Amino acid sequence: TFRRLWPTIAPFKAGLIVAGVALILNAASDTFMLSLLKPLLDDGFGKTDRSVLVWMPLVVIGLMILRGITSYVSSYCISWVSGKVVMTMRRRLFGHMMGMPVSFFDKQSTGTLLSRITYDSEQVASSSSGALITVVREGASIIGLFIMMFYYSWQLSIILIVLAPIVSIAIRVVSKRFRNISKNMQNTMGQVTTSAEQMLKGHKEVLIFGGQEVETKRFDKVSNRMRLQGMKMVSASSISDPIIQLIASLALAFVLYAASFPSVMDSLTAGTITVVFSSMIALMRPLKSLTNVNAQFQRGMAACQTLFTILDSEQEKDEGKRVIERATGDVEFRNVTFTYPGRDVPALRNINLKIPAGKTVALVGRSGSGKSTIASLITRFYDIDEGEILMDGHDLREYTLASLRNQVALVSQNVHLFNDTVANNIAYARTEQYSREQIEEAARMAYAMDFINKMDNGLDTVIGENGVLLSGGQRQRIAIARALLRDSPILILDEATSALDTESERAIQAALDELQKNRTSLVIAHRLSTIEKADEIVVVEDGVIVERGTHNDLLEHRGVYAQLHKMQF
Amino acid sequence: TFRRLWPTIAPFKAGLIVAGVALILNAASDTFMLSLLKPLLDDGFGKTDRSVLVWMPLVVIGLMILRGITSYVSSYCISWVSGKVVMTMRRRLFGHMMGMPVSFFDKQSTGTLLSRITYDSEQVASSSSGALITVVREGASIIGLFIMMFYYSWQLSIILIVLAPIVSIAIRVVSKRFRNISKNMQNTMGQVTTSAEQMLKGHKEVLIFGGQEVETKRFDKVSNRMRLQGMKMVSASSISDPIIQLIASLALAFVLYAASFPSVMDSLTAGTITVVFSSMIALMRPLKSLTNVNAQFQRGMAACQTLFTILDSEQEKDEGKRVIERATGDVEFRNVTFTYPGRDVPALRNINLKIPAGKTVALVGRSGSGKSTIASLITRFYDIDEGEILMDGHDLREYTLASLRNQVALVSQNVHLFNDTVANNIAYARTEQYSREQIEEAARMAYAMDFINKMDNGLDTVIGENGVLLSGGQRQRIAIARALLRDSPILILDEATSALDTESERAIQAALDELQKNRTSLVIAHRLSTIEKADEIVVVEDGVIVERGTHNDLLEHRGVYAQLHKMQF
Secondary structure: OOOOOOHHHOOOHHHHHHHHHHHHHHHHHHHHHHHOHHHHHHHHOOOOOOHHHHHHHHHHHHHHHHHHHHHHHHHHHHHHHHHHHHHHHHHHHHHOOOOOOHHHHOOOOOHHHHHHHHHHHHHHHHHHHHHHHHHHHHHHHHHHHHHHHHHHOHHHHHHHHHHHHHHHHHHHHHHHHHHHHHHHHHHHHHHHHHOHHHHHHHHHHHHOOOOHHHHHHHHHHHHHHHHHHHHHHHHHHHOHHHHHHHHHHHHHHHHHHOOOOOOOOOOOOOHHHHHHHHHHHHHHHHHHHHHOHHHHHHHHHHHHHHHHHHHHOOOOOOOOOEOOOOOOOOEEEEEEEEOOOOOOOOOEOOOOOEEOOOOEEEEEOOOOOOHHHHHHHOOOOOOOOEEEEEEOOEEOOOEOHHHHHHOEOOEOOOOOOOOOEHHHHHOOOOOOOOOHHHHHHHHHHHOOHHHHHHOOOHHHOEOOOOOOOOOHHHHHHHHHHHHHHHOOOEOOEOOOOOOOOOOHHHHHHHHHHHHOOOOOEEEEOOOHHHHHHOOEEEEEEOOEEEEEEOOOOOOOOOOOHHHHHHHHO | OOOOOHHHHHHHHHHHHHHHHHHHHHHHHHHHHHHOHHHHHOOOOOOOOOOHHHHHHHHHHHHHHHHHHHHHHHHHHHHHHHHHHHHHHHHHHHHHHHHOOHHHOOOOOOHHHHHHHOHHHHHHHHHHHHHHHHHHHHHHHHHHHHHHHHHOOHHHHHHHHHHHHHHHHHHHHHHHHHHHHHHHHOOHHHHHHHHHHHHHHOHHHHHHHOOHHHHHHHHHHHHHHHHHHHHHHHHHHHOHHHHHHHHHHHHHHHHHHHHOOOOOOOOOOOOOOHHHHHHHHHHOOHHHHHOOHHHHHHHHHHHHHHHHHHHOOOOOOOOOOEOOOOOOOOEEEEOEEEOOOOOOOOOEEEEOOEEOOOOEEEEOOOOOOOOOOHHHHOOOOOOOOOOEEEEOOEEOOOEOHHHHHHOEEEOOOOOOOOOOEHHHHHOOOOOOOOOHHHHHHHHHHHOOHHHHHHOOOOOOOEOOOOOOOOOHHHHHHHHHHHHHHHOOOEEEEOOOOOOOOOOOHHHHHHHHHHHHOOOOEEEEOOOHHHHHOOOEEEEEEOOEEEEEEOHHHHHHOOOOHHHHHHHHO
16 A cells, blocks of 8 residues: 555665666566677578678677676575665564563464464565556566567557457457346356256156156157257357457458558568567566556565554553662552453452561462463453552552563463574573572582483583484473572462473472472462472452462361362372 | 276267277378478478468468367267267166165265265276277377477487487486485485484574574584585586486487488488478377376276176075965064164064054154154065065065055155156156146145145146255155055155144144054154054164063053153153
């Protein structure tokens, strides 16, 4: 429709200009090929001299060489412009990906966001490249062949370009009329076959009454009706092709009789008629390619505008300005109601949860997964619909999102591994600040050191995809090591791995216990031992608290703690 | 295999042969058009302004007119051959199909059996016509074009037909080389899209750990990898077209440089070169049409063997030569096990039905299976698997089938009415035997006289499909009137009409009583009055008999009929 992509093809534009120059060569080279047909017939084979026909093969070989180099450099420079625009468009899209909110990542588009970031961007790049290729190459071919036909024999060019649309609309009206005849006769066949179904019910009603011969005569009559109807079908269908070919050659007869009647003619010698005939025979293809230009361009800018509304979605709401280096204050829920966007059911109703600093708080009692929201609220993955959660007496909306995300650590079994070293994956965004010996120490306590000895390069081995594909318990150990490196004041772990490694699960629990000796920890518990280590347990069924207290208080008051001990046993 | 249909085209093959007299000429005309390219260039505008340029437009007009008439008569004569072969094929298929058993028609494929009559045999005729046209038209085109080759410029023709396989194998090997370069190529950027998938997947961890800048910096490197891989793709796919045009025009330059030899020219003359190049560029199409000849033959002849499987298959087993004139004898079932072919469960266990002469026997079973085929075993629709049914002490297998089906009358609401007149519908297959006054006499006790006078014509109107159409009880009244005209000794009824006609359904029962006043009557019943009108009652559940005897005897004994009776209420 309308491009604001012109600034983001601004620094590469001259390269496209060079590309355009190549296409200005390219079709013109083809034009010269058609011009090369002129000395062949009039001078080369016609006259008895050999001199034009030794001029022929080197010149046509040079033109083909020049067409080859100009096509290579045309596609190379259009690939440069398309590649650099998909470079900067992909980079700007991914830059507006990582600060943009999580609500697009709620199973709206996960695998097709790869399509949005890759396939749509190469689609608009290739569409603009092919659109420029089509427009400028077939435009150069059209204007070259037009100036060719006007230069060599302008009169016959004029009358033959006059004769092309009248025979074209003659083909159109003949095809329309015969298509009307065809569809009416398809209806007539419909009628002839509705009578043919009657014989198939006939079969049963024939053998029950012994009427094979009378049904044979009636099928003879109706099948003669099919034969006559099909005779008129194939006659009317195959009368089309001689008619269209006859009116098409009426134009050829008009040109050839028109080479004699206007007695000022005969300006053409021998080869120029072959030149202009091959000119329109080879010109019928650029016009057909130019008809699809607006459709290709509209599809490409449709993909571009889809990518533009992908870019047009805003980032996080970062209206807060409270920068806090160390958030040792208590996080406290105050009647917070939160709803999933696009879902009518409220994901969380009003909750007065209290998390003291240092004291370990557990969260149990889920129906489905009600704690998945709660693990995300303090990190502010999702915005709160109503209510306030206070840290240091301050709401998270008052906080900056960067510092608030800095004070939170997240450890889980599904921790995805970046395609970097082990020491880089432990130390995301802090590798420059932390010394490598500190990553080694964090590995020492995290009890993952034996496994870091296991790969070849030690702490510098790649560990993500197309790497070692490290075990999920060791992925958990990696996440604990990240937690010891960050030393965030709060802790949140799902523990819903449900797979216990031989003596490595005990090391995982021990490393988590060293990690949670200091600072607070809000734990989603699947291990029963982690319920014993919990100082506080808050039982929330979906969005409402069932119970709040220490585990010996629910050892007497049953509630749904009996159901929790049931599904733990 | 091959054909075995030549006798089926043998009386009409002369209409094929004159078609060939068209077809070769249709291609000869095209050859003559290319022959017209020789005096138009050399003897045309170069030498004389006049004379020849009166000849060429009129000759082109005459050749195109002749092409039109020969294409019209070619299509009409091949339409004659295809219409006559589909004529005799549909006649033979239907005439064999009428005696062919109902066991194929029990929902194997009833919708496609109309296609087996029309579409499959039309595919056979159209494929044979297309195969013959594709052989002989482009065969004469190839032969005439090679005659044009060897008549004009012998040396250039022989070297050009030498050079065309060389450029063909060269274009094949370079296409194969660039293609498996592409299939070797296309995995490497897919491995980069895996890294992009992991990078966009780690959005949550990039948010919580605060690593947007590092992910942007690494996305720059991986997107540079995508740009380089796309560069290599576009370069590798781009370098094909200069290579293909370079090798094609290398072949063209070979022809031109070999034409620079003075031995070859001096026979090539002024013109005579455009006809040869145009002969190859026209040939590019008949050879491509001829290479599909075996596929076009084989698809249609596979359809022909499929139809020949239906044409030669099974028939009625009619090893009984006992003609029966009047079936006054009692129908007696005796330990008769019948199973539907292709079905696991036996549809009928060993039952010993007795049908005494002039006595009403009623089948009132509610099972929905097993008893409906009893109405088909009496007509020998399905053959006996075990046991014996004897009529007048004689088995119906030992009876003549045609006389037996003469002895059966069938009345139901599922009766099919033919496309003939309603007078021909009542007296169907015996309208020569019975007079029109006898048909009106049968209509008198049929109580259908008001519906006959309701029609536009009266007694001789058409009642079937694409006709006046008839109500369901009035469609039954055709079958009661057909029963009075046939006066068969046995009755077979359905009684599934839950809907009852106002003041005519009781008249339908009155006409049925008129018919049942004499002779045997086996009735399938659901209406209570049909049960009360029974002389004898036999109720069958699944394939087994549960109660035999009159309505009073089953009115005393509870058994199975009483709960059936309460279900009827």
